[model samples]
Target chain A: MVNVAVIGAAGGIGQSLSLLLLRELPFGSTLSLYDVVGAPGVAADLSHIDRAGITVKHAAGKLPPVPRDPALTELAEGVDVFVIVAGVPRKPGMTRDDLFNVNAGIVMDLVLTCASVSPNACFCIVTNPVNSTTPIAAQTLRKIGVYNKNKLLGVSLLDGLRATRFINNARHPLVVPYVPVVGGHSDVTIVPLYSQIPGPLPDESTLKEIRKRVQVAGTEVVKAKAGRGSATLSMAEAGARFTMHVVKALMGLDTPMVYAYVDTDGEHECPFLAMPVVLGKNGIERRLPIGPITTVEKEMLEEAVGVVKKNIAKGETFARSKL
Target chain B: MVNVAVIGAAGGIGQSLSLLLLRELPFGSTLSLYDVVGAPGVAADLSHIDRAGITVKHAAGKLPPVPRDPALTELAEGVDVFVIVAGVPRKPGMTRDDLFNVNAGIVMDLVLTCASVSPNACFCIVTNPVNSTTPIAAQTLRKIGVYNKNKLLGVSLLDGLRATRFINNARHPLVVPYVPVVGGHSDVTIVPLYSQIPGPLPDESTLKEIRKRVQVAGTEVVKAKAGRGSATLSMAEAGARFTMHVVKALMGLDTPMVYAYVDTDGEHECPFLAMPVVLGKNGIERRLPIGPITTVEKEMLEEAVGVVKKNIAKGETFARSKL
Candidate 1:
């Protein structure tokens, strides 16, 4: 059984994640749910389905509360895919960094637990400050001596959201196309490598604007809430897309090329960012090297590096404190 | 602007309620969401909507710490009608008492809060053990001298679910025939008052069996969860039906005679049960009154009264506990 653990399962992303996982994955797949509270209720409630492929189990509130060893170890135990969607969601007037403090600590504690319990499972970080937190997770695992470079990924499906809409905007829906996004998951750090994808790509200025828009589109939701929570339904949808990719890749689905933030060595001196990564059983099978770039694209890539450097360092510092 | 508060706004019922509310409500209605937590994120995220009239606001954080104060006072501050989908859902092997214990305290707390912050706002409770909880809420408000028999209702829209399905089973969908369920919300207490509505009614035994099935169908979902969560999707749909009735009633539509667990001393000694009531601006404009019954129905009604009495007594005991 492919066990999937959803941290913060009681909240919007978590519950929606639960529902979507129930639908996409085979029934009877053990769904391990973890949240500070409400996991039991959500798990027991969702477990009522007649479907056979899934068996819902609560991984929260276990006895003998120990360090990160207890909750995380209990939840990550034997899990094949660990998706981190835990921590404080976005609020009004909050930048990506504002989300860093709460979520970084959460990911650190949880990752150590995953290391002890389910070292082989690929981790998908959906927590904000993803630009940084993903690197933090990688660094923490390294300290624990359970790091697997190929199996760690920071989700950037929001780029896919823009690509799908951009396709619809540029052409008809009947014409299927894919736009590959490279670079970090923050403002201007994300690059919609439009040149590689077929179809009439946006012009220089348009492409640059589109890239900027995708990065800060989250702010639109923040403003909408006025002073409330961040995006749940859309984030839920994006997280669903990434989770399904993991499932498909694990099940050996061919043609599973999605853009995600995985371990980066600044290849070609690009920022720690999402790029066209071929995901499979061992997480990323191949990081397709950078191809031809436009003059504007070249500039955007250079600028992204500086932005992501700070974000990545922040995550590293946070993880170091935990260590 | 109609301020709408969806309690349990992040659950299946809450999500569905918000979706429909956003789509169908009058333009410019302020959609207020209040959950124990994460309401802000959900609200802010949804507020990015470019939709015509509805703007969402998060009434996030804990329920008001004080009893008799609105749990989220600002959430109910100007709400014209409060649609409650709150409470602990039931599970398999859970006795009525078990369901009662879980939902009773929650409903009492919510109603007490509503009494103080929104006495004028219409209260429609979708939380189950509805048979008891509605009575519990009504009496709770009465004890505080803020009870308005006309303004409070225990939504029994699932009866409508069964009725619609039963009619579909009996007649073609396009035929437009309808069945009406009467009596109370509990299994034995429900009376599918086939005689009062227009249709080729079922025979005595068949009618009794169908009514029994309708009342216990929730248990069907509970069993399906296999002791997990109860039915959220259908419960949400049912809750929507009742909310729409309130909206239509306010809009001067001949809000169909529907069943709700409402306060009554019309005929029998039953304090609260899902009887046919005309919904309109005045709130439960009139009790539609129960009609003639067949011998089998009479026997079932007697069975129902016995079941309902225990439920009512249970609610009363629970409500009095906090006092």
Candidate 2:
């Protein structure tokens, strides 16, 4: 009853995420793949893996992609979840926002196509500038009258991962499953609540360094790449990790708790923020409060709200212009 | 205590395989990456993956690769296992032989460099045609006096996976762990023994169809790709799967039983065969007999010997020329 579609199944993150999903998605589920090019190839590649329970299906769109690509529309028929990683990747000397127009259109158009076909499908958006892209995706769905605030999730799980890893090395190792990350998915806006962590605290100065590292880990890879690409391997794992939670929720296999950027429904001053949410048979079981945190983290949250609102406004503005 | 190095750490299969190893390699072990290019980028990407215990290191070689590039030699130090996947990829309208010269030099030279630095490291060769490349790697090591018959492994596990998936779905799904595959890693030289499968048998006709598909699945992906790439995701998974077993054995964690192409030491009529073997602290604890099989599979084995021998000779001749 569960079919998970990887919207950009041929890209770097898409390929690795699809590979992970092959092993992790609910057995007997279909792994639906779509891309402007190479979807058939990736699907063929994935089909050769010996996961007998999961079937692979794919379709390729073409150049000058349309508002609702027929290939994705046809491919998305039975999809219960859509993991959208289709967008221009950040390259050397390219600011994340330099990717804005290309990624925005890619996400907006692909979302429109997939949402049109599978209106109830949970969307796990992994495209960059998620603070705005989530809003863009929401506005696209809303403009078409298919908006489900709980169903559209911007993947901010990588922030949690980076934070946990940084802090874990400072003290714990694999002991902390995940750190609670909230507020947004962009620079200065991502908040990792270390006070909420279950282990001994690092010194205040050490914690400060760890917090800063988590915020800029993306750039760490960008510069390391020198020119090839940015943060793909980690992002792929995060995207796959987020998609699995969505699948488990839809399949009634488990009610997993995760951090995602989504419409807060006025729970906070901002319309959308990254916060803890429980996932179940419905896309979102319930939203959790930010709860306990260090005063420094609390201060960061306040600053994050305004920045998130601005990005939210930006995405909403783009979507309405298209509408 | 264990360090696993992926020689082609930047290419299609290398990147995906490295990503898998990041998750599956022994905790606290260093994942050393070396490639002709993009190793730093891949390393940087992997570093952010939140595996607190896994350390990532990488070095890149320049174009027009040398026999012993300092980049790989420096990265190869302290490496306990080397999974060699550095080679030219198979392309559309390109026979596997078309890849031979390029891939052979790649395996031969990289193995020369890595073996020079870590003389005792186990080599899991994912470069093709494995029938020849395995021998090339072995001969290269032997010439340098670093050869260990038990340490050089040809990664034919993908064949096991394809055959298992094909035959298992004919009856079970994920119920069967694996199918026994033997001989070489290419074309008709590959062999799958389903008659010895643990489950109920399918009709003779269906079994024949499944066997043929396992042998041709590589071409299946190549045709479907239509020129983009070939069998990377599955190959990555197989490489990682094989590497994990190799690491597990080195760490004294478990004596894993796996089928790998290696020198038979005259245990078989052919010099090397993909037969069952136990893996422990040393690379190959004990080679297992092919066990019982139908007369038809035995007849196929006889046919495979000649083809495998030809490939083995090609590799040895290449080694002698270099010497």
Candidate 3:
């Protein structure tokens, strides 16, 4: 009933994300894959899955320094959702800022191409330094004069998954079930609202440590991998969940509440911030308030807002220089 | 309520397979990941997914030339299903026999370690040169006096997926729901039974081409990758489905019928052959007959059996020398 395109369907996160979508996407759905290389191979590999009733298509882009490729135009037309996971991954000892210089251009070029073809399609960005790349996408779409504030999202859901996981681990057998995460999606910018949960968390000092752990969870995986990769599987899970929420919302199947980093459209002080949004037929139906925060969390939020504002300005500055 | 361990959880196929298992494995299940290098990272990556009530654990082994490591012993304990996708994958120009030289010993060592710790676990082999490595695992288990003819399976279900996919392509939009593939898991040795399908296939020459394509489908992905990797996502799909069948049957949930290459136990001339299996409480409860075939099909089967026989002999020889 829908056409979903994965922009970087051949990379570590893209490959696993495609597979998960292949398994879970509704029947009659079409999965379009695109990457600078290996897209055909990944498409051919995934097309053999015996799952019922789905069509697979793909287009391979030219290598970079070409800036953009027109190969994705036909594949992008009429796409209901474009999940952009097309960006270089972070290596060992690399900060999210270090990733920005490379991924910023990649995300901008891909979003511009995809939005030109399917201007109405919802764009879900999962590129690194999401705090910046998401705004880069917004500016690109606005440049083309077809920007829909509700239709673009930066996937910060991985932060929520990490917060829930770390809290569950600290509590051992007992689980907190779900944890709400807000603000930007990067180190120091991520805010886990532990005060919002019903159950009791660890003592103040331990709680602060858990907060720090959630902020640097990506680094934990990067160090664990040594040199191999960084958080592909977990990121794939989060990306799939986020994309599916958008898909379900588009289909009018269910109204689901989820958090994502997106253009605030004057709802918040920062141009783009992560907050709870109710998803319905018209992309994001409602933007909910962050509810309440403790004194410590309030201080953290102030710091996160300053960093998020700078990240947004950085994205806009890049777009202005390029376009 | 099951414990599933992926031996090469960090490799191409293993990483994707582990992710699929993490998403689909039943509640209350424990997923244990082990590899020589990236197991810890893969485990840490997957543990962040907030998918209800499954726990993830992993053990990292020492680098090669060190041969076996004790890291897997504790993690291998109490595993209800041991999926061995650990091995050297096929390179652009490498043959399955070339893979046999390296993967054969690796499979043998890991199987010995896992079987020692969890003798009752169902062993599902997804390593390369499965024709040889499967029997190598069988002999290794026999060396430890814990070989269960019914409990060991070589995952050859990918052939069925490829056969089904290729036939569907030849027929344009029309599809054949299922295609039965038997015999070995490698080129020339793989046998696809097109005559068994309900619908009509293409002309004899076209059918012949389809057969050949199924036999060399792994090579197709390898060539398409252009030296990147082999058929990983598709193989992961097949491996996960095959392992889940073993899990479901063992849990008394469903009496599933599946095709896998395994010890025929005198059901056929070849000691190990791919055939229809009726799974039950104790691994394979029965080996179903392969049904009927045309004269041309019979000729292919004869050729397949010969190649399979040689492959089995090669594995037994390697295991005998190594053990």
Candidate 4:
């Protein structure tokens, strides 16, 4: 049974994500929850559920937010996978750079402590400014000499979910659900290739509208929440499914070919990009190219590369300055 | 296909419960969300999840807290089930009657609007003090002349779940997941039928410990939350599963023998108590007798009836005074 740890498992995203993990994780699996506050309460509440054969453990991190929280190391030991969801929720009217500055540091601090103990664990990063925080995870691991490129994945599956939903909604009654999305996990850097969907796609203008909606779908929720909260429930659904895929792959049960923002490791122009990769016992079996796309989608990818490179640079610069 | 409406679909319990409904409700069904605020955002966020066949619609209740919010009736039409989850979170120092006073009116107001539109729909009440709120629901429906005892179920499924989880934890590696729990959904009234399990049961002291733990499980969560919140995610899971059971039973897909706090209708001494019931297309096929129990359990039930009768009386008192 795999021991999966959820970092920052007390906040809005973390609480629901932890609940999903409790429901979906296999029997006999260990679910360890870590947070500065409320993780114990979450653990206490969740432990009362009827789900059998899963062990739930939790520890509260030291206050004042240390660089290396000791309580985290104890729980991190023997942990096979660490899903990092520790970051401030994106507030309304906050600039992209403003979010980046706050969440980036949180990612570095958490990843450093977690990866230090579970050096061989697969890391799935779900914190925002994911275009950058994902790279921050990779850099934090590398600085400690425990980086495994294949084992690091930034969860951009939400984009794929949003893309599938938009396409299916447009072509209602047809019920086609899968549409591949690749690129960074941010505003325009995100690319949804609807050209790949078979059987009667939407018209040109409608496609543009769907594409724009997919790119700014996060904002749609932010505006709708009207400063109350970000997209916790849907994001939890995405993260839970993503975690299951990685876990099943490692357990030699399912080799799912899914998209994630991962370290290119010089296989691509950008240092990190979201692309389709076949999973295996070793995390990434092989990286796949962005399959056939229209000229319009191709131009979008080129634009995405320019923005993605800048985001990656910012992440690396932050790591270089701090670590 | 059925249409399910969630009253108060944007609070802590409501938001997560809505997401689970989106994932679990069958395709071709509709999920209608109603709340004082934020339901539209929750709707928009969940609508993007690619769960095909389910249409998600939302309406915001007007502010100033009217006795009858007009937005709800519009959304409640043609509904097969209504899950009422509108209530204030119970805090550290608040008394049970304090919570009952506030939530009872909210339930009455919400039930009046929803039942007015969908008088034939099954109502699953998950508000706190379910012992009372469920009675409030029955009285409100009766006052409106649309009462159906078989169709009103107070969600006590969480009690069964907690009972199952605690027993399995004690007898680790010998997993058994079902334990019947009956009585009211509150302290001292909740009874877990561990003696009914088909194995070597715990020692007397251990059984008493488990029983007490089950009775005060809500308090465990309340204290662990430390004044922050109370049992949102676990309650959401319970609510979602209970809703599914009702839906599936109504669809004639499966007739599940489950427990709920329902009107006794002269078959028992207390007006409302949790008991085994066989479900059918018409809600309750028949209410089953509480099968074999230990003398200890029998004594517990006697105590439970005294408390539950008072709870039911409080709800009825409020209803008679208001409606």
lDDT: worst 10-residue window of model 1 chain A: A44-53
Candidate 4 ranges with C-alpha deviation above 4 Å:
A265-267, A319-323, B92-99
Kindly list the per-residue Cα lDDT of model 4 for residues A56-85, writing each as its tens digit. Answer: 889876788767778887778898988888
DockQ of predictions, in order shown: 0.10, 0.72, 0.62, 0.78
lDDT value, residue B212 of candidate 4: 85
lDDT of 1 by residue, B108-132 (tens): 7776776577777788877776777
- Model 3, A122-235: lDDT tens digits are 888887777777777777877889988788888888888888877877776777767899888878988888889877766888887788888777777788778667788888
**Full ranking by DockQ:** 4, 2, 3, 1
Q: Say which prediction, candidate 2 or candidate 4, comes out ahead on lDDT.
A: 4
Candidate ranking under lDDT, highest first, comes to 4, 3, 2, 1
Q: Kindly report which residue pairs in candidate 2 clash with one another.
A: none
Q: State the DockQ, from 0 to 1, for candidate 1.
A: 0.10
- TM-scores, one per candidate: 0.59, 0.93, 0.93, 0.96
For this target, which candidate reaches the highest TM-score against the unseen true structure? Answer: 4
| DockQ class, candidate 1 | incorrect
Per-residue lDDT value at A191 in model 2? 77
Candidate 3: segments with Cα more than 4 A from true spot:
A171-177, A200-204, A319-323, B92-99, B169-177, B199-206, B321-323
